[PDB]
Symmetry: D3
Subunit: 317 residues, 6 copies
C-alpha cells in the first residue's frame, strides 16, 4: 500500500466536530448503573501452561445483561502486589484466547487479563439481535444505543478493571489498559468510563470518527456499516445508525480520558485510516503521545513495541 | 471460473453416508414441541407499493424463543383462494427485504411471503450467543444443537408455513416453498419438517454435506467453519461442531421430504460446490429433478427460472 | 469500492462544454432519412412462456442497413389499449434475451418490448467492420460517424418506438423508454431522436462525456477506447475517434430531450463514473430528476426500483 | 502459475477423436471455390520506416466476401529472389500492425508480410453479424460454418500465400508460414488448406480441441465460448456451436498438413492449455517437432526463438 | 486457501529418493574445515531494552569467508548456567532483528541468540556473486556448491552453536535450535552438521525436496528457482542448479540428525508445501514428532506454540 | 490502469531541488579513479547464432573491484568502421542475456554490446554485502555510497564504453547508449560520467527522484526501499539510505549530460511514475526531447520504437 489519506500536515490538525448527542453523558451514567446492578461473582480456575515463573488461570465474571465474560489471567509466580494490565484483542482476531501473548505479558512482570470480547473470542453475549444486520458485529443492534453491540462490550471492559482491581495480588494504583485496533478502542473507552486504569496504550484505535471512516476506509470492518446501508436503504435508518454510533465513537469519549496515553498509527493503514486515529488523538486532553509510522499499516509495528514497553515500564513497573 | 469438483459422472453417484446421530428424530420432535409452545399471534399491516393488481402487507409472527419474525406478504388483488409461496432469501443477501421479488411473485398469481432470516434480513433473534464464533452466523452457537443459529431459523420456516396456511385467502393445499442457496436449504428443511408445503424448489441449496463442504468450497460462507476451527483449535471443539452441524445437514433431512422437488446446480459453483448439492439430491426419495448447468455458478440461472416457473405453474396454479 | 470521483458538490455543477460538431443536427437528420428508407415489415410470432395473464411474442422488424432487429414483446392478457415500454439491455448483458424481466414488466401492466442490441443480445448487424478495433463493440467503425457501431443501434431504438406505436393494443400517447447503462443511453438517445416516448428512465447511463470517461473510468467498457488507442497510436486516429464519438455522446443529445426523465447514479460506480452521468443530466433541459445513491455502484439499486415504478405509474398507468 | 493440465507422460499420448463432420472436406472445397471467385487485385504502396537494407510497403488485396485485407510487407533491399514468410498475429494482439517485427524478419533475410486479421489488427470484415455473440470475435457467426468469423480469416490466410507467391522477388518454393497462438492456428490452417508454404512454425497454437479447451482453459479467449453459452442457454445452441467449430478445429485440419512443422508449448500455459496443443501436434502426420518448455506459459519463449530461427534458416535460407 | 497437495494418507508415506551425490559427506567435511580456519573472535556489547529480568547484548562473531555475523543475545538476569536457544529467522522476514521475540525467549528462561542470516537480517556476506541470479537469495551462486548462498549460512549456524556453547553462563548440554521456514531448515541443518544442539524444533521447514518444491509451491520463495530457469534456459544450467541444491536439501541432511526433533506443518501451506515437509520428516531417523494442522498454512500456529513450549521445557528447562 | 500521478501540466513544470551532497563530484571522481586502477583485459570469443550478416561474440572485461563483466557483442558482417550501441537491460529483466535483441540491433547496422548487470543478467559482483537488505538489489550496501550496489554498476557501464571504443571496427565518434527503465538510468548515468557516447536514448528511466519515488510508485522495485525501512526502523537508517541514494539519483547526474538525448514516458506507468521521469528530464540541460504516451505504462511502446530508430539513424548511421 501507499499513502492515501490526508497529508501528515493536515492529519495533525484534523479535529472533527463532536457528534455527541445531548444525552451522551446520561446514557453512559445509566449504562454504568445497569452494570452495577449485576454482581461480578468472579471465578478463577488454574490452567496448566508450559512456562516457568508464571501462574495461569481461567477468569470468569458476570457483566451487563448477566453475560458471563471470560479470558486468561496470567500472574508472575512471585510475591505481589503486581502491576496489572487488561489487554483487549482485535476484531475477529482472537486465536486460542491470546494465551501466549498474555503469558508473555506476565513474564514482563504484569498480572494480565485478556478479556475475550463477547461473541468473538470466547465470552457470552446475552443481548438479543433486534433485527437485521450486515455480516459481522459492527451493525448488530445498531438502531438503538441501548441494543448496540458495543454497549455490552464497553461495560464488560469497565467490569474487567473492577474485577482485577479487587485481587489482593494486584496493585490497584498500577493498572494499565492496552490493545490494538478494536482493542485500542476498548482501552480508550475503558479509561474514559473508569478511574481505575493509570495509563492507556492504543495501537491504531478503531471505532473512531464513524462518519468519515465509512467514506475513507478501504478494508473491513468499517465497511460493514456501508454493507448495512446497502441492505437497508431507508434514509431514516442511516440517520438512526449514525445517531447510535455517536454514543460509542472515540471522538466523543476521548475528552473524558485523564490518564497518560500512548497511541500509534501507520500512515498506510487501510483498516483504521490515519485521519480517524488522528481525530481520536486530537480530542484527547491529557498527557498524550502519538507515534507515527510512515511505512506501516494495520499490523504489528516493531518500533512501537519498544515504545510501549518503555511507557508501561515508566508508569507501572 | 472453471470446473473444479467431481466429474459429472461421479457427481451423479455421490451419496455420502448419513451423519445423523441416534437422537436426530427426537431432537426435531423436541424442537417442534418448543415451537408449538409459542403462540403465533400474527399481525398484518398494509404497505404502500407502486403496483396495480397486488396488495402488500408487513407480516409479523412469534416463533421459537418468542422471537418476532417478519417479512413482506404480497397477495393478488382479486378474489381467492390463492396458491401461496414462502420464499427464503440467501445468506446475507436480503436487500430491502426482497420486496420487489415478492411483489413480482404475487403478480405471477401467488400469495407470497418472504420470511426474513433472523438477524440477517430483518427478524428478531432472541437466542443468546453462548460463546465465541467466527465472523458471520454459520458458527453462532455451534457447540450445541440446542443453541445453534439454524435451529431457530428452521423452526421460523415451519412457523411461516403454519401462519400462511391459516389465512382465508390462501389455498392450504397449494403452498410451495422456494429459495436459492441458504433459501434452498430452508425450503428443503421446511418440507422435511412440515406437511404443509405441496412442492419445493431449491436452487443450489446450502447447509449440505458439511464435512465435505469445508474441504471443497472455495468461497464464503462454508469457510466460516474453517475460520472457527482456526480460532478454536481444541480437537474436541471440531468434533462437537460437526456433531451439532449434523442435525441441520440436508443429507440427513432430505430423506423426510415427500413433496415433489426441483433443484438446480451450476457446475462451476464455488459457494455450494456441486458435490454438496448432489449429495442432498441423492438422499431425496421423492418425485425429484435436478437441473444441471455446466456454465453457471452461484448466481441467477435464467434457464432455471423458466423451469421453476413451469414447475410451480404445473403443481400450484 | 469507495468514493473516487468528484465530490457531490462538484458533481452537481459539472457541465462540460458540448463537443457537438457543426453538422451534428444534419448527421442525425440524414441518418433518420436513411432509416425511413427501410420498410419496417414487422413480424409477430407467439412464444410459449409459463405465465398467466400475459401473452408473449417474438417481434422482428427491419431497420438501418436492412438489419433484422428482434426481441421479446410481452402484452397484458386483457383488453387494451395498454401503456407500453421499450426496454434496452446493458452492454454484453443480455441473457436469454431478458425474457423474464420483459414478462414481469407486462405483469406490471405495460406492453413491453426488449430490443436486442445488434450483435450483442440477438439482432442482426449488417454494417461492415471497416478496419481494426479493440476487443468489443465500442470501437467498431470508430473512424467515421457513418460506420460507427452505435449509429445503427440508435436508429434501431427509434425504429422500435415506431413499430410498437403502430400496434392497435398500444396507446401511442403512453409509451416509455427505459434501461440501465448502455440501456439508459439508448433510452435517452431514443427520446432525443424521437417524439414518440412520453417519458424516460435511465439508470446510470453510458455513452456520456467520452473525453472524461476514458480518463476516469476504472472498469470496462469505456476502456475499450483506451485499448484501441494503444493498438493504433497515430495522433490523427485519436482525434478522429473522439470526433466520431461526439455524434453519439449523451452530452450532445441531451439538449434535444423534451420528455420528463428520471435518472439514477451510484457514487461508487466505476463503470459509468458519476461525473459522466451528472454531465448528461446537467445538459438536460426538461422535467428531470437525478436520484443519487452514495453506497451503490454499477448495479441494481433496490431503492431506485421503487422510484422508477412510481414514476412510470404516475406518467403511464 | 504452476502445472495444471495433464502430466507430460499423458500429454504425449493425448490424441482426442476427430470431431470432423462428414462434409468437412466439402465445406473447405466450397469455401476455397468462393475465395477463387474473388480476384486478388493486390496493391503495393511504399511506406517510410527508419531502417537501412529493407524496403517497406503497405500491401492490400481482395479476399473472401470482397473484403480488403491489409498488412505491412517488408523486403530485403537487395537483388532477389528472396525466401518469404507470412506472419500471423495473436488474438487482439496487433499493435501498430506489428511493423517492427515485420521489418526485423526482413533484416533476417525474409520477404515478410504480416497479414492483419479482419477486424482485429487492420483489415476489413465484410461478413455480417447474423445474431448475438459474446464479447469478442470467437463466437461471431458461430451458429453456422458459413457465417463463422474464422472462415473468412482462414481464407484470407490462404489468399495471403497466393498473393506473395505471385511476387517476382519471392522464391515461390521457399515460403514459410509463422505465428503464435491465433497466429499459430492460422499458420497450421493455411498449410492444411494450401500447397504454397514449404514449412510451418506455430508457437502454442490456438483454435484446437475446442470441446476440451472450454473445460480446461483458465484465461481468455477460449472462455468467450463459455460466455456465449451463458447468454444463450438453449441446448440446441451448444450443439450447433460445437458443430460449427469442428470445421475450424486444428485437430481436424492437422491431418492435411504435409509440410515440415515446428511447434512450441509451455507447460504452465493457461490460454492455450498444453493438452489442446498436444492434441493438434498428435494429429499431424508430417515431419514434425514439438518443443516443450516446463517454465513458460503463453508468452515469448527465448529458447524457442533460437529453435525457430534455426528451423527457418535450414528450410528457407 | 484450501487443500491442494497430496492427501494426508499419501503424505505420511512420501519419502522421495535421496538426491545426495557421492561426495555429499566430503563436501560438508571440507566446508566445516574451512569454517574451522576462521577464528570466531566474538564480541558482546550491552544493548538497552525496556525489560526487567533480562540482559540484552549485541553479539558478533567471525565465520566462513571471514564474514562478521551478528544478532541479539538475551540472557535471563539471574545466576546461571542457563539452557540456551539459537533462533533462526524466516526468509526476508527479519524486522528489527527479531529483538522482541529474542527477549521473550529469555523471559521464558533461555539464553537466546537470534542469528541474522547474511544479507537478509543484518550480518555480512563476504561471498562474491559469481554471475546472474533471480531476484532474491535462493539462486545466488547456484552454479556451484562452493559458491551457493546457503553454504555460508549453514556454516554460520554451526558457528553460532560453537560460540554460544563457549559462554560460561550457558549449559552446553542444554542447547536447542529453533526456527520456522528458512529458520526451520537452518535448525535442522545445524543439528545435522553439529553435535552441540540437544534438541530441534522446526516449523514448516524450507529448503526441502527441491525437485518437487519447484513443481508444487504456489508462492515465493521456491519459485525464485523457476524464475532463474526462465532467465537462463540452457538445459545444463538446470542440471547444475539441482546438483548444487542437493547438497543443501533437508532430505539429504535429515539422516544425520540424532537429536529429538519436533516439527509442524499446515495442510494448506502454499510456501512450504506439505509434501516437501513430510519428505524431510520421513528422512529423519531420530526421536521425532510431526504436528499436522489441517486449517493452517505458512503462518504462526497458536496450538503448535504450546507444543513447542512443552517440548523445550521437557528437554531443556 | 488509469492516470494516477501529477497532471501533464504539472509534470512539465516538476523540477525537484537537487539532493546532491557537497562531495557529489568528488565521489564520482574518486570512483572513476578506482575504475581506472583496474586493467580492462577484454576477451572476445565467437558464439554461434542462426543469423546471416551478423557475427556474435561473448565479450568479457574487468571492471571496478576486479569484477568480470560480460555480455553478447554482435557486429554487422561487413567492412567497418561501424556505429555502436551499448544496450542496458531492465531490472531483473534479462532473459538469455538479451541475445535476440542484440542481434537485431546489429542487423539494423550497429555493433552492439548488451552489458549484463552484475548479479542480475550474468556478470560477476565482487562487492561484499555489508549487512541486511530488502529482497532484491536496490538496498544492497545502501548504508554507504562506497558499498552501494549501483556504484559498481555505473562504473561497469562507463568501462563498457571504454572497451567498445577501443575496438578497431567501431567508429569511436558514433557510439550511443540505450536502455529502458534500469537500462535507461544506466544510459543516462553512463553519458553523465563519460564523454564517449554521442547520444542517449532512455525509455522511462529508473533510479530518479528517490524521495518522491518511494511515496508515489505502486509497483516494484522502488518499493524495495520501503521494504528495507520496514525491516530497519532506526530513523538514522532512513537518513543514511537517502543520503547514499542521492549520489546515484538521475536528478543529480542529469546536469552532467551534454549529449543529445531522447526519452519516453507512459502516463499510466506505475513502476517509474511519470513525475520521477519528468524530474530527470527537467534537470537535463542538453539537446533533449521527451515523448509522452498517454495510454502506456511500463512496457514496450511501439510508437517510441520508431522515434528511437529515427533518432539513432539521424545521429549515428
Amino acid at each position: 500500500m501507499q499513502l492515501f489519506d490526508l497529508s501528515l500536515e493536515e492529519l495533525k490538525k484534523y479535529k472533527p466536530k463532536k457528534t455527541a448527542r445531548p444525552d451522551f453523558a446520561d446514557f453512559w451514567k445509566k449504562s454504568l448503573e445497569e452494570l452495577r446492578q449485576v454482581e461480578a461473582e468472579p471465578t478463577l480456575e488454574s490452567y496448566d501452561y508450559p512456562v516457568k515463573g508464571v501462574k495461569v488461570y481461567r477468569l470468569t465474571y458476570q457483566s451487563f445483561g448477566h453475560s458471563k465474560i471470560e479470558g486468561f489471567y496470567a500472574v508472575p509466580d512471585q510475591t505481589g502486589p503486581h502491576p496489572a494490565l487488561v489487554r483487549f484483542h482485535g476484531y475477529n482476531a482472537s486465536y486460542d484466547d491470546g494465551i501466549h501473548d498474555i503469558v508473555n505479558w506476565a513474564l514482563h512482570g504484569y498480572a494480565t487479563f485478556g478479556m475475550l470480547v463477547r461473541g468473538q473470542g470466547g465470552s457470552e453475549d446475552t443481548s438479543v439481535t433486534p433485527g437485521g444486520h450486515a455480516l459481522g458485529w459492527m451493525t448488530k443492534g445498531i438502531l438503538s444505543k441501548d441494543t448496540y453491540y458495543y454497549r455490552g462490550v464497553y461495560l464488560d471492559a469497565v467490569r474487567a478493571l473492577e474485577v482485577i482491581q479487587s485481587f489482593p495480588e494486584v496493585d490497584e494504583h498500577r493498572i494499565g489498559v492496552i490493545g490494538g485496533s478494536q482493542g485500542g478502542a476498548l482501552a480508550i473507552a475503558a479509561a474514559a468510563l473508569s478511574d481505575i486504569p493509570k495509563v492507556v496504550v492504543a495501537d491504531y484505535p478503531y471505532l473512531s470518527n464513524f462518519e468519515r471512516a465509512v467514506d475513507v476506509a478501504l478494508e473491513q470492518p468499517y465497511l460493514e456499516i456501508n454493507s448495512y446501508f446497502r441492505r437497508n436503504s431507508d434514509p431514516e435508518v442511516e440517520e438512526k445508525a449514525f445517531e447510535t454510533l455517536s454514543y460509542f465513537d472515540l471522538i466523543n469519549l476521548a475528552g473524558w480520558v485523564k490518564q497518560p496515553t500512548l497511541m500509534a498509527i501507520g500512515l498506510i493503514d487501510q483498516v483504521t485510516p490515519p485521519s480517524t486515529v488522528f481525530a481520536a488523538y486530537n480530542h484527547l486532553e491529557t498527557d498524550k503521545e502519538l507515534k507515527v509510522y510512515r511505512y506501516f499499516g494495520h499490523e504489528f509495528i516493531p518500533a512501537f513495541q519498544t515504545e510501549k514497553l518503555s511507557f508501561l515500564q515508566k508508569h507501572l513497573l
